[PDB]
Design a protein around this ligand. Structure first.
Ligand SMILES: COc1ccc2[nH]cc(CCNC(C)=O)c2c1
Ligand SMILES: C/C(=C\CNc1ncnc2[nH]cnc12)CO
Ligand code: NA
Length: 155
């Protein structure tokens, strides 16, 4: 099966600055800003499409990681696409991909848009509890970056 989900975030912060924190300087900023993420490292690649990143985090008190493959990175248009290609545990989920953009919000602020595509085996459905947890993580993520940027404008 194929399933899509959308989310939206608003910030007072300007889109190019948010994008620099979220994407360009993600390897430095994300482990600083996000209290449940310890490190963000390049496993392979030069930063462009194909690059594999390893994000190490703590969940339920245990150290885990997830691998992201960069699929598209377009700073001109504040776009960033990636998919999840590995990590700890397992199972019904063949693939989960993300399309993200930042656009001009209010007045000079932003809106962050994320489309999530989930491919499953057969007529398996995406697990609702796991989706709720992921959504909550997304919200907390975007909030933590905003907070950190507010406290550190000229980094
Ligand atoms: C949570 O919401 C958003 C919204 C717009 C976005 N643009 C770029 C990203 C970051 C995507 N990187 C990771 C490691 O998740 C982003 C996230
Ligand atoms: C891009 C994001 C997180 C990276 N992945 C995770 N970050 C933190 N906890 C997790 N539990 C499962 N996956 C994760 C949003 O937190
Ligand atoms: Na951290």
């Amino acid at each position: 099966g194929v399933f899509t989900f959308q989310d939206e975030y608003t910030s007072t912060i300007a889109p190019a600055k948010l994008y620099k924190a979220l994407v360009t300087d993600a390897d430095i900023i994300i482990p600083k800003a996000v209290e449940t993420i310890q490190s963000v490292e390049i496993v392979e690649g030069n930063g462009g499409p194909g690059t594999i990143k390893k994000l190490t985090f703590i969940e339920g008190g245990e150290s885990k990681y997830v691998l992201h493959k960069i699929e598209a990175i377009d700073e001109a248009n504040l776009g960033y696409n990636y998919s999840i290609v590995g990590g700890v545990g397992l199972d019904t989920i063949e693939k989960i991909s993300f399309e993200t953009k930042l656009v001009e919000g209010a007045n000079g602020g932003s809106i962050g848009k994320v489309t999530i595509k989930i491919e499953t085996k057969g007529d398996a459905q995406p697990n609702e509890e796991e989706g709720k947890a992921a959504k909550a993580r997304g919200d907390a993520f975007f909030k933590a970056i905003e907070s950190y940027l507010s406290a550190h404008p000229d980094y």
